[PDB]
Amino acid sequence: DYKFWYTQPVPKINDEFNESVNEPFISDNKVEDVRKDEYKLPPGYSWYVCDVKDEKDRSEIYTLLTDNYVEDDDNIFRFNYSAEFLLWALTSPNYLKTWHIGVKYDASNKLIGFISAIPTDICIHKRTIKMAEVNFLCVHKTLRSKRLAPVLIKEITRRINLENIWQAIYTAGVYLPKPVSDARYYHRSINVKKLIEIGFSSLNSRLTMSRAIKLYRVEDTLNIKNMRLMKKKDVEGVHKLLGSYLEQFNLYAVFTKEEIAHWFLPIENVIYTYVNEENGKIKDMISFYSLPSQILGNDKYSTLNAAYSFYNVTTTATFKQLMQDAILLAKRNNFDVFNALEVMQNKSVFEDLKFGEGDGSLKYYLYNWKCASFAPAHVGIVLL
Template sequence: MAEAAKSPSKEDRDEDEEAEDEEEDENENENEEGAQTGEKKKKQKKKPAKTEGTAGYPSTANGEEEKEDPDQQQHLLQMLRKRGPCEESRRQTAREHLFWDTQPVPSMGSEYGQDSGPLDELRTVDDVRAEPYPLPDKFEWCTCNVDDDKEIDEIYTLLTENYVEDDDSMFRFDYSIHFLRWALKPPEFLRSWHLGVRVQGGGKLVGFITGIPAKIRVFEKSIQMAEINFLCVHKRLRSKRLAPVLIKEITRRVNRENVWQAVYTAGVVLPRPISECRYWHRSLNPKKLIEVGFSHLGARMTMARTIKLYKVPDMPQLPGMREMKKEDVPRVHGLVLNYLRKFTLHPEFTPEEVEHWMLPRPGVVYCYVRENEKGEVTDVCSFYSLPSSILGHAKHNTLKAAYSYWNVASTVPLQDLMYDALILAKQQDFDVFNALDIMENESFLKELKFGIGDGYLQYYLYNWKCPRIEPRGIGLVLL
């Protein structure tokens, strides 16, 4: 499901290049096997992304505009420390993509047409090989049981030690076990789509990739897809070319369920994105962010002035804000479903899926509704928790990051609703609040003092061509 706000890490880059360079090692029968849908959606998405600046000065707690001198505004734009040159090098599109050029995805140099539809010829389940793809010697496939405490702990350890990391090796995603179970067990999930690679003989877990079912609308067509996520290979085994085989095998398993399309995201440019989005970041605990190197103190800025600039009120400003309850699910489902219809690419949730994805879970997902005088739920905001380990710091070991999720403002401006979301996230002790420039988010990013990130997040569809979609047409958030 989704990508992280952070830019791709060196480890992520290795996995992508590994997939691209795999063509000569692929099983020679691959092109006869039928449409493959499992593309890895690298979680390159949310890193404790270090942003480049903040622009715009929203109202302070007392409703008056806070005025800053021009020098301060200029230095605020340099508040968050820049990433090195890695991001640009990862965005080179001229090089060959040997693995992806064998897959049913548009080539990098192809034009964006106006038609939509599958790229591969129609197949049936009987056309898909029944046996798993072969692995290199000394490795074996396993289906992971995320309900088993020992197995979920192995998955957690693999991801915590080998998954998305920033280019400077300062931060690494720290998906909690509760988060992983939430992310991987939506209604109608298939255990066979939780795929692992072990050392032969039931040994150590060294590779992982997942899919979950989702109904996705693209333009005017509703398609049953797999959301592909959590591709991870142990750092010491990146030379074994396990990533392409993981992608091929999850594709085979998805196809065997008569599902032929997939959606995924990545921080790198692969053949070929349907949309390119940016992460924005709003500081909630600037002192800590500066101490850990996530951001730095701007020229002519003191710590006291910086803390004041990002301070939010202690309590929500909109009347009627409260935590979502189970009895709110039907109303929230209606609000979210109706809102998402505005966007070119969006999920079509069932009430059961809205209950799963949005009902609050401590330390995982937070959801609040606004109730009017008649007791009717009129607005909803939500965010999820994805912390990062802080590597090698003497004082701090965890960066708490909240990520904007599903937000519907039907009776108040979206900016006012998201201001309360910031306040609620601060109440939960988050250090930073991240949001993509998708949906209608541009209407509040600058005004609420978000700084634009230097990382990009590409959205991809597997075995489906369609016109390019602007970020404001994206109504899908992947974890």
């Protein structure tokens, strides 16, 4: 029925727009009209402004998400974003502490809800719009289906609107009104044996355990010999390389130099970026972020370490060679699996590089924006 979503400036289930439509559902919005009062919570609960740069407030967010965030359909896994990753993801340039919103249960003083946004310039079908990118919406498992999520959504919407921002981008594995694109995930096994032991990958009489380990074996030698961790000096070159590349897509972020530095400069166990520098210019880049999952009730293993493909550009190699080196660099860093979405040029490399098609997909959404939907090959942005 989408009783909450149908109240919002988003497309209906049946809405389809021509390619030339590219505009807000509701235009001419005024900051002066925005409600100044916080949305009402049920009795016994209060808004809390989280300070993500405070280790202890950050750890409270970490706990909530560790225990209560997204699980796969089969409840094998729960994502387990680290505390340091949350710091990185939430404190990009011009972030607002007031857009990192908690809800506490008063009697326990415990965080039971969260939602966040950061500001980003988003180009959709050639129009660049100031938007908020929303993530980490989470209600405690003991408090589900009580309509707390719309309260979280309406309150962050209000706080964003106070900044004269009227559009947002967000992604979800669930279907909501109405995706602008949909991309499946694909997985490249690295630690084949672990993936078999936890019930994720499957063997048969043609594919015995030794055969499966050999199938996924990689040569520890880069196609691009000088690929190396990005350093502060590389910022201008990555900004040039990436920013030019992204302009071919129908949906992408428009990064400033400050944004390049924050999003790509490497941080151990969070973000890995490698570059190939020739005569002081950056000609190729690989990047992936770390996102482990908790393995739910497995006797032997508690964590699956996973790298997620981020942005990758090649000018001196084939896209296949570049991604083969991204898998190698992920293996060198102790990742169990390398995950990517069929966005940008990715789908082309998946069969040859031994990726398997996953079980679900990630839907991309705009809030208060009307445009034609598009195939994921035309998506040029990867959210966290």
